[PDB]
Amino acid sequence: MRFKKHVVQHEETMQAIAQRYYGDVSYWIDLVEHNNLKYPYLVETDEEKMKDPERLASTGDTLIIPIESDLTDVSAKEINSRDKDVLVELALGRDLNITADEKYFNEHGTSDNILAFSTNGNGDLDTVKGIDNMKQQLQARLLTPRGSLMLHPNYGSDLHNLFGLNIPEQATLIEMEVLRTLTSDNRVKSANLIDWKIQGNVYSGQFSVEIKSVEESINFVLGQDEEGIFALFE
Amino acid sequence: KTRKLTNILSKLIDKTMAGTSKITDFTPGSASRSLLEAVSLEIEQFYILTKENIDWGIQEGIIEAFDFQKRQSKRAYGDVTIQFYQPLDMRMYIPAGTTFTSTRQEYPQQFETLVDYYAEPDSTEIVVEVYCKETGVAGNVPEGTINTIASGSSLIRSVNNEYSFNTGTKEESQEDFKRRFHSFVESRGRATNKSVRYGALQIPDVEGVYVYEETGHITVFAHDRNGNLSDTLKEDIIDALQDYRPSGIMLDVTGVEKEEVNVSATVTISNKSRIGDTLQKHIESVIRSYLNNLKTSDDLIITDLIQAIMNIDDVLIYDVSFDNLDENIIVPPQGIIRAGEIKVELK
Amino acid sequence: VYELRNYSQAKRLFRSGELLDAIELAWGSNPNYTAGRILAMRIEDAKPA
């Protein structure tokens, strides 16, 4: 259950509040009855409220409006930028940082024993959030061979076997495998080739990944309020 | 009974139209309609005020005249002392809503000030008033409970409430208020068997009163906790019933026909090693308590006494028997049973 | 100088005072345009016990 709570504003009236919220002034008597208010409902200052603190409310006192409010179906335009940042952060999850020391496991991508946990510098375990989290998960999936992870046959990639010849065919195989691996992630809305080239031994390519938009993540997290889990089991 | 907003507005418009035809626009946003709507809102608010006043008067107007106060639910409030390490080096300001709390699990109640306060520079300790956030008796914290401020400056040496809070109350129901009024009204009655009995019972040492009525005579049986009626208590009862008795009728006071029952019991027991003086005295004290607990019209049923004695212990006490008690001792309304000589034989 | 993002971080750092109230006001001044990464400083030349 959730309800709206209104702070009394300067020289406000109960009729104005009723019109503002219920869309009709007629509910002002219901508002009085629910809040248990005496006749001078909104006193000028606290000196009047001292006469009867129980039954009177002054400026800056909080009223309760029993309208069933719900965090979903709320216009994203009202939400504050920091609130949107936190919401997308929750949507994309928090996880322990393992992709630290990028250079090392970039020098040995195909091998095992390549990544490890790290500390945040404050004596606690390091954590990656939001975009850093997505980076970590996409790197780990691409680096993981498919079928090597226990309890998860399909998680991973087949790039360890695509160390083939230097022709456009193997390039296309790599590209298709990478697109499969990126598509496998639920959060990745789509992925597509940008550009590739061959330099004899070395292959080089780059991709573009569109994560779910702020609106979708906001809708998902605010929907999750009904359950209260606020966690990711994808 | 009362008009309402739409009806007041409609009548205002109709009267305005009838008064003059110079105004005919009564659409939304019109100055004239806005003014009439504002008057209508004020009148509707005064109607609600009258309704509240009359609803209060219906249930509290009459009884209030007889010095009977209905207990309203209140927030517990009281004074607290704040001490500073030194005289203040500037005007300190404590805003309204400043919270005070206690460092105990016994009292999670939160107290806050409802008004602004100022401490002068010259001051060294200032007292303020705090109100419990919750109505009820839960805010009636004892002395020395409030000892913390959640938004106070470091200059404070110590917070402390100098007296226990007692103003927190729970709302008294209407039926209890009516019951007290009706009780008082009944107590105004006089010159009746019920009123005599009531006036006798109000005496401190009187435990139980039976009034027996005869044509032209009244006799009052009274007893104390012990079943006795002291001469002094008798004189007090007479003096108190001088105001109660009818005119031209004779009133007499007498003791209750006490009956001391002597009970010699033979208790069979299982655990022979636990036989001793203490168990004997315990059983005898139980029997004496049972016998003395009986009221004026209560008959001594022997089977219930046996039940009680066997319920002292369901396995230790084996069997009981009495030689004095052969059959239930019926007594009249004016004859109380009391504990006489008691003996218990362990077998 | 310190970098602040959360109110709990400022409460841990700044125990009380007007500065903490100013940080709270700044992160609650407007419903839709509260600021971020507020930079705070203590002017008191205090010493530890």
Three-state SS string over B86-99 comes to CCCCCCEEECCCCE
For B46-52, the CB contacts below 8 A with 24+ separation are B47/B2, B47/B3, B47/B4, B48/A29, B48/A39, B49/A39, B50/B2, B51/B2, B52/A38, B52/A39
What residue type is B74 in one-letter code?
K
User: Cα–Cα distance between A2 and A68 in angstroms, integer?
Assistant: 6
Q: Determine the length of chain B.
A: 347
Q: Are B124 and B149 in contact (CB under 8 A)?
A: no
Structure tokens at B299: 């008959």
Q: Which residues contact B195 (CB under 8 A, 6 or more apart)?
A: B189, B244
- Chain A residues interacting with chain B (CB cutoff of 8 angstroms): 15, 25, 29, 38-39, 46-47, 49-50, 53-54, 60
Chain C residue closest in CA terms to B154? C16
Contact B154, B137 (CB under 8 A): no
Place of tokens 């292959």: A203
Check: CB of residue B305 under 8 Å from CB of residue B253.
no
- A169 contacts chain C (CB < 8 A): no
Q: Which residues of A touch C33 (CB under 8 A)?
A: 80-81
Asked if A206 and A111 count as a contact pair (C-beta separation under 8 A), the reply is: no
Q: How many Cβ atoms from other residues are within 10 Å of residue B46's Cβ?
A: 11
CB contact under 8 A, B114 and A47: no
Distance CA A172, CA B79 (A): 82
Task: Give the residues across from B83 on adjacent strands.
Answer: B125, B158
- Enumerate the residues of chain A whose CB falls inside 8 A of the CB of residue B135: 54
CB contact under 8 A, B48 and A15: no
Q: CA-CA distances (angstroms) from residue B20 to B13, B27, B28? A: 11, 17, 20
E-strand spans in chain C? 2-4, 38-40
Cα–Cα dist A27/A19, whole Å: 8
Task: Determine, for residues C36 and A82 on separate chains, whether the beta-carbon distance falls below 8 Å.
Answer: yes
C16: chain B residues, CB-CB within 8 Å: 151, 153-154
Cα A34 to Cα A21: distance, rounded to the nearest angstrom: 15
Q: Cβ separation of B41 and A15 shorter than 8 Å?
A: yes
Asked if C8 is an interface residue toward chain B (Cβ–Cβ < 8 A), one would say no
Farthest-apart Cα atoms in chain A, separation: 90
- State the nearest Cα–Cα gap between B251 and chain A, in angstroms: 54
Beta carbons of B114 and A49 less than 8 Å apart? yes
**C-chain residues within 8 Å CB-CB of A120?**
none
Measured CA angle at B9 (ends B4, B11), to 5 deg: 95
Please give the Cα distance from A85 to A73 (Å, whole number). Answer: 19
Residue identified by tokens 């919270």 is B99
Contact A78 C33 (CB under 8 A): no
Distance CA A31, CA A221 (A): 31
Please report, for residues A157, A208, B215, the alpha-carbon distance to residue A102 in angstroms, rounded to integers and kept in the order given: 19, 20, 114
Q: Which of C36, C34, C46 is nearest to C5 (CA)?
A: C36
Report resolution (Å) to 1 decimal: 4.0
Per CB-CB distance under 8 Å, the chain C contacts of A86 are none
- Parallel, antiparallel or unpaired: strands B99-101 and B125-135: unpaired
By what method was this entry solved?
Answer: cryo-EM
Q: How far is B134 from chain A (nearest CA, A)?
A: 9
Find the DSSP H helices in chain A.
14-21, 28-35, 46-49, 81-92, 102-107, 131-143, 168-184, 214-224
Would you call B75 and A50 a contact, using CB atoms and an 8 Å cutoff?
no
Sign of the four-CA dihedral B241, B242, B245, B249: positive
Assess A80–C contact: CB distance below 8 Å, yes or no: yes
Under 8 Å between Cβ of A35 and A63: yes
Q: How many helices (H) and strands (E) does chain B have?
A: 7, 14
Cα A123 to Cα A39, A116, A119, A129, B240: the distances in Å are: 58, 16, 6, 18, 85
Asked if A82 and C34 come within 8 Å (Cβ–Cβ), the reply is yes
